[PDB]
Amino acid sequence: AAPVTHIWYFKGVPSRLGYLLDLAPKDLEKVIYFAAYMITFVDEERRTRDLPSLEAHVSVERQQIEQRRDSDLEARAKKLETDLAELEAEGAKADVRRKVREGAEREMKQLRDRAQREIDRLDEVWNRFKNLKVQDLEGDELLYRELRDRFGTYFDGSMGAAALQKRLESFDLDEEAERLREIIRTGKGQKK
Amino acid sequence: SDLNDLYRRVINRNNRLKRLLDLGAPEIIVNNEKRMLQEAVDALFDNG
Amino acid sequence: KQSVTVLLKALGWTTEQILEEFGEYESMRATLEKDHTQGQDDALLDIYRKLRPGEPPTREAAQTLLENLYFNP
Amino acid sequence: DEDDAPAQQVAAAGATADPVKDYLKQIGKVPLLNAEQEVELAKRIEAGLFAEDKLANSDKLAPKLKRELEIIAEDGRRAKNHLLEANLRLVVSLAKR
């Protein structure tokens, strides 16, 4: 029902597997045994043609966090002002205002730390779009879902032996040989 | 002979995969079957 | 591969008491300063990651494993 | 204090070459269901069931409303898979025996 891959041709010495697709054996173990994704195909032309539209969608999306950050911080600023003032009018103990403000700023730090998580994750998903070259392994399953859900019809991704079958279908082996010959003609070190 | 046992496993796991694909099943469950099917074929051609 | 100081630190022995017993043998003192990790809680979770990768560290779960692996009867 | 946080993320993306270990890992963290939660999930199954039933009928329904029924039908599919993935831990317990 589902294609599989010969144990002989992969999972052996590298004179037989050969790095025919430029992938490490650790990389192969992850993709064909369903532990990491591969981008079997990218619509690199589409991405260029519609680029401002996707740029427009992310930019307005970026605006919302800033508006939300402004209001949560404003509530944070109001929260610090209110609890210190109310405690000091009562004057129940020596340092009611200092202890709760210490508690209040700890809450601000947790909110600020959360703000770092949301912006950086958003930053991280955007930069993986810009490096959407084929045969790119993608370890984090959660990150792949964010790529897949936010945008389809541009990157095609898969998992397992079916993904490898697609990669070999899209292979242009004559051109790979030419670039490999050029490296042999002009190359140095272990790279040759 | 041991080939019968190894052929039995790949037939069993392939058959169950058809059942799982036929009805609506999640990604987690179908992936595990595809993983086990791949492992079964590996054992048949070169065990170990 | 892992060091001995992280093993001892995984046990209840702290850095201060460790050095009195082993201050006359430079191998453990050299290992101690080169060992960047410090603290009983820190050492326990680190070895959990090395021995059984794949799961988040849990304070109780890390502690029972060391009891389970060796000291359990 | 962000010491534990980098360790947990790099430990989520591990190899786990053993098949049995990988499946247990695969189950991961999914929310175990208390009484009120799982009964509410069952509500959305039959809600989604009646939605696709009317869609399965040949008589014409409005297009915008049809998408709303599709939303209920899609949610019924989501509610089914949510229930199964939560209860995956149970079946592994009985498999031990």
From Swiss-Prot, chain A:
Function recorded in the entry: DNA-dependent RNA polymerase catalyzes the transcription of DNA into RNA using the four ribonucleoside triphosphates as substrates.
Q: Which family does it belong to?
A: Belongs to the RNA polymerase beta' chain family.
* Quaternary state and interactors: The RNAP catalytic core consists of 2 alpha, 1 beta, 1 beta' and 1 omega subunit. When a sigma factor is associated with the core the holoenzyme is formed, which can initiate transcription.
State what protein this is by name: DNA-directed RNA polymerase subunit beta'
The protein's organism comes out as: Streptomyces coelicolor (strain ATCC BAA-471 / A3(2) / M145)
Reading the lineage from the top rank, the first entry is Bacteria
From Swiss-Prot, chain C:
The organism's superkingdom is given as Bacteria
Show which residues constitute the signal peptide.
none
Per UniProt, subunit arrangement is: The RNAP catalytic core consists of 2 alpha, 1 beta, 1 beta' and 1 omega subunit. When a sigma factor is associated with the core the holoenzyme is formed, which can initiate transcription. The RNAP complex including the principal sigma factor HrdB also interacts with RNA-binding protein RbpA.
Provide the family line: Belongs to the RNA polymerase beta chain family.
Report the protein's function: DNA-dependent RNA polymerase catalyzes the transcription of DNA into RNA using the four ribonucleoside triphosphates as substrates.
> What is the protein named?
DNA-directed RNA polymerase subunit beta
Organism of derivation: Streptomyces coelicolor (strain ATCC BAA-471 / A3(2) / M145)
Q: What is the lineage of its organism?
A: Bacteria, Bacillati, Actinomycetota, Actinomycetes, Kitasatosporales
Curated annotation (Swiss-Prot), chain D:
Transmembrane regions listed in the UniProt entry: none
What family does this chain come from, according to its entry?
A: Belongs to the sigma-70 factor family.
Q: Subunit structure, per the record?
A: Homotrimer (Potential). interacts transiently with the RNA polymerase core complex. Interacts with RNA polymerase-binding protein RbpA via its sigma-2 region (residues 211-347) in a free form.
**Function recorded in the entry:** Sigma factors are initiation factors that promote the attachment of RNA polymerase to specific initiation sites and are then released. This sigma factor is the primary sigma factor during exponential growth. Its activity is stimulated by RbpA.
What name does this protein carry? RNA polymerase principal sigma factor HrdB
* Organism, scientific name: Streptomyces coelicolor (strain ATCC BAA-471 / A3(2) / M145)
Complete-protein stretch covered:
196 to 292 of 511
